[PDB]
Symmetry: D2
Subunit: 405 residues, 4 copies
């Protein structure tokens, strides 16, 4: 039977993910024989995460708290919101009310809920170029048109942002939202400077726009001085945040959040129960305890954080020993490094050869771009690989490198 006839026309806005084509082409070789170390993942290190400790909490809460197995309010258990509030004020410089927090199915869920309430099909949403592949996909399947703005070692080029806004309006285009990942961007790995952050806020006010700040990697900072979220600088209330504990507490727990105000918060809350009903009860209680027991500092700060900072150094050391000639980013936050093949080279076919020949998995990155740029780009992860995997990983990458240029 042809089910294609029953699809909604908006289903044609839904398309495949390149980061999924290779993550499957590898899943085929990883189970059907071959052994491979990947630099393509986006997960945090499960070994750096206190699993046994989380198992203990999971075990206690399930037998201790009956609610751990039942529905939770649409915006999350009050205690998690009260704790997340204090947590943000403590470690991310955020003075936010618990009533303004909405616990979602991870940042992904937060970005989706927001798009549903803020996007009308055709609306143009401007983003960094490149940007997080999944947010672009999320927004386009909602009918949005994406317009990207170039980035550099200091993040989005705020000067190019204003020009894009003007070029768009000069065409009579309707623009409303700006989507940005200020700290440790996926996939570039760069972070917006404080100078560009204040300039961004000025531009949002100037053109009367709203900003959606993605803080997924705010707690993965290693070098930064005292860089604060745009939200902490938001005196006009033009920014909305989409956060997550996935890179901390674990990426499978599905715990994230939205910080918004006024009628936007209201509509977000209103539409939620019929969409996901509520964020997972165990996850919320596990997170509530993790925070209350002060395990953030005890395990993530003075623990997993250093573990990531290290893998970052070794991957860069490895790159700066074997590929000192090539161009790549120097992240002071996040969990990715964007490597660049010679200008012109194909990044998707090269990513294939690394598997088809050297047995190492890397993400093309090309699909992370909002236009024709980024062909020769390649994203590399260092948060999942072991200390040993990384050197061999990029060494094999360096093997095929000169083996072609």
């Amino acid at each position: 039977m042809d089910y294609t006839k029953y699809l909604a026309g908006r289903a044609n806005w839904i398309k495949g993910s390149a980061l999924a084509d290779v993550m499957k082409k590898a899943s085929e070789l990883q189970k059907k024989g071959v052994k491979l170390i990947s630099l393509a993942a986006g997960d945090p290190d499960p070994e750096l995460i206190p699993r046994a400790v989380l198992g203990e909490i999971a075990k206690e809460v399930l037998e201790k708290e009956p609610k751990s197995v039942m529905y939770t309010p649409a915006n999350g258990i009050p205690e998690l919101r009260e704790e997340l509030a204090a947590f943000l004020k403590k470690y991310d410089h955020l003075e936010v009310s618990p009533e303004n927090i909405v616990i979602t199915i991870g940042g992904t869920g937060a970005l989706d809920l927001l798009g549903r309430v803020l996007i009308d099909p055709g609306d143009v949403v401007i983003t960094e170029n490149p940007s997080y592949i999944n947010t672009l996909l999320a927004f386009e399947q909602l009918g949005a048109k994406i317009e990207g703005v170039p980035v550099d070692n200091d993040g989005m080029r705020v000067d190019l942002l204003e020009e894009k806004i003007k070029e768009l309006k000069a065409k009579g285009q309707k623009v409303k939202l700006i989507y940005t990942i200020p700290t440790g961007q996926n996939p570039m790995g760069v972070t917006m400077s404080m100078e560009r952050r204040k300039a961004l806020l000025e531009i949002a006010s100037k053109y009367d726009l709203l900003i959606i700040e993605d803080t997924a990697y705010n707690f993965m900072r290693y070098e930064g001085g005292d860089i604060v979220p745009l939200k902490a600088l938001d005196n006009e209330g033009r920014v909305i945040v989409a956060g997550t504990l996935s890179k901390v507490l674990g990426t499978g727990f599905r715990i994230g959040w939205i910080i918004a105000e006024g009628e936007i918060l209201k509509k977000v809350l209103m539409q939620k129960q019929p969409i996901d009903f509520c964020a997972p009860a165990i996850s919320q209680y596990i997170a509530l305890e993790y925070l209350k027991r002060g395990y953030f500092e005890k395990y993530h700060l003075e623990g997993a954080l250093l573990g990531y900072k290290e893998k970052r150094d070794i991957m860069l050391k490895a790159l700066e020993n074997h590929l000192p000639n090539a161009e790549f980013t120097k992240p002071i936050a996040g969990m990715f490094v964007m490597f660049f093949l010679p200008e012109g080279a194909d990044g998707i076919s090269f990513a294939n050869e690394l598997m088809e020949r050297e047995g190492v998995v890397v993400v093309p990155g090309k699909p992370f771009y909002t236009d024709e740029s980024g062909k020769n780009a390649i994203r590399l992860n260092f948060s999942r690989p072991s200390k040993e995997e990384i050197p061999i990983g990029i060494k094999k990458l360096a093997k095929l490198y000169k083996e072609k240029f």
Copy 2:
């Protein structure tokens, strides 16, 4: 600042509930701490659930499985889908391939993913009248127009279903989907007969329609014979199921699924990673073990199920005892009883008056209807309250009843 201006016009399709307005007046009475018995809730008894056991497996999973903290595939871990296929084939008379099942954020998430792929704004979707408010709400905020078909003690009046289709088509109206809750429907509590289930499939085939079957309460059947889901008789492949373990495993785990095929499955999977990324890793693993070691039959079939059946009889005897001259449903499945005030009576204010004067919380019901009927309806839940609360619950309900009627 007026955020109203930044909203997307489709955000106007988002509206309040009733199972929210009453739950806010109850929390307002509980905030300023006042005792109250609840018959409104839709949760399974957390005490009839083997929390302790789940906790141990939660501890096991997190301790020994690193993947229980990371991203699972968008459609779920292969082992869970393979187990579900077996669990369904054994307890729900359904034969399905693991490749055709997708683990979602409960039945809710399943219904939403399905709405997003099958609904274009303006599409009419046919449902039972009354039906589950959250699905009505979920589909309407996607822009669908709801057309209801009356139900009786044998479920949806299938004959009137064809009548509605004929009426709609006579007007030139486009319809493609029928959403039905065959067993232990929420809020009516009635279950479609096998006779009507066979006719429904024929009507869907005659008008080339697709059916969305909500199996949420298929495992909460008491004094029932041998009923099988529409999907088991679906020889043309016209039905899609939206199931869940919410009532079995726990309503907070967020574990549900979609069973679709062909291009509909493809599109559903393709859009999932950018929406929820994946169902909770823990939950997925907690459910995997739970099923693999036969705890469904050990704790639910011969433990929880019997507890619910018992609470069912107590509420009915209580109703039959105190309000013999009033009308209400006699469920053979599910967790609710629909009570009817005198024809003409306002159930919404009655519920408020019952909570303000007697301290018992019940759900209006009118909001579950698709047209102007059901004004005198009141939904009653018996799966969460205690055996002691029930009698006292409907007792007080009867006092205000005879007080006015």
Copy 3:
């Protein structure tokens, strides 16, 4: 074949118009023998229009101007726009650039073009209650939600308008446009007072809303003072007008216009060629010469106008002496009088009986309301019927009335 399955879901937003249903029930009576006296349709008197003259200029234009048979720019021939600009300056307080004028397929097309550029599905658009049925229908098939505001002898109640707006925003509803017919409204026949017009402009500014002014009957005024359009008072550029020459030159020529600015004008014009290509060349050239030769004064102002004014006096005169106990409107402009049956009486039912038992055609009216009110309303037209037919008509109308009430 069942074409229902091919329809776009938005086609479901398209619905029937009683003002064209019973109007088609009369089209059957005429072409079937029955001698009918019509007080329905809103056509101008074809005998008060210089048909012969127009016939002469039509001949001329066709033989002397080769363009009268070919396409024209999407926004209309420059000469007509320039001629309309001056015309509007001399008779309607308007100082507009010919560049800001777009020649459309009557005001109908003007309203549809604006809806397409300003309305996202779900958007709330505020209108008067009652309001012009075709415009409500036009906006809703574009997915808008209509919210009406009661009118009186002085037009829209501006005080209730601000309450509705505060009401909407309190619910978190998004609103943006206000559609008003300030002079000689269809169907009430009332005109907004200069006092309320200034207040409306204040509210639009206060809430940052746009106003679309329908000027259809600005040239069928009979006794106001220097009442000026909202657009001539629009110092903030918040109003857009949708005008037409159909009530002057002839309702069948399809000559109307949109007056807008900036990006709205840009987009309105960008989308036009692909939907209508251009307004009728022959009609544009006929209108041009009609204007250039001073026929507006010679025939409309000093001919048609007076005839219509006479027809109005006659209808009100007849309504006053044979039906003095009924309440109805007294228009100072336009071509309609809204007549009212006793509260509770059914106007739709009354309309069918009148036609069936007396051969007089009137328009129900209820269809023009935005809510449940207006059941007893009946709209009467005095522009088309001869001055001999008018008294005979309402005389019969009075008879059915009195024997019923």
Copy 4:
């Protein structure tokens, strides 16, 4: 003020048109002194049209028929529908009922009315490549996704059509309509062979698709045998036609039609009054007399048609004589000829340089393609320019051609 913020998101789907942009850049040249030879716009020759004749009928109609200045039923006066039905049966092998004919504002309005009832945002609509730009623009601003299918001198490559269809379905894409211009296509000027017309009908039936047949040039055929419209072969009723008399009676009268059945016809009719109200009364009556008096035979068949055929031969003679090494279409019908510059050559700049240096106007070509093809295309029209102007225009064109290549 920034009106961009008030735009509907869907306003962003509206974009510029080279065809409209070039026509306006030429009208400015005509007024700005310069006198040029035009081979662009798709207008009929105003001298080959019996203007003088149409003039007296226009005068006659206006003075004798009062209905010629008033509204008409949304679908057009009954007499016209009946005459068109007879006209189609005689000169276009079409047996259609007068009830299935809807008089629209030209072929453009017909196509817009159909898109609104048949397209949901995101729907894929397949067309020829290239195709008429206004239809592509019309469907895309309605949110449609266009997929073109290559054509040759025998029209659409039906074999490539089925491969495209299989390509779309394999990706899970939803498609339902196919828009085609079988005879004398704009811009290619080629006509589908009867062999492909039957194959197209088979494919539509095989995949259950609807076909919208554009018959704009069915009456400007010169050498085809007895080619019949797909609609005359539509035994399953899968084709809907969008026709017009613009190329016969005159392109500026705005007299076109839709031929559909069942629910599609019902909905196209229900929505029509609120978008255009009705086609121009004068144009309808003028067309009614034109047909009834047999002027199609007397002035078009034995007049205009032979005149156009001559211009058709003259342009081909001039081209083959001065550009014998360039490839260009040889139309057997229509009014356009697609000229091709050498592969790689930019057609839009060439058109500007031609208009600037030689003062001859042509259309860029590239805008009519659904993909990146056509860069070197240039559309040439032979219906409007005089017998004399054509050779001069093509010579000047040849001059710049070899001056560049």
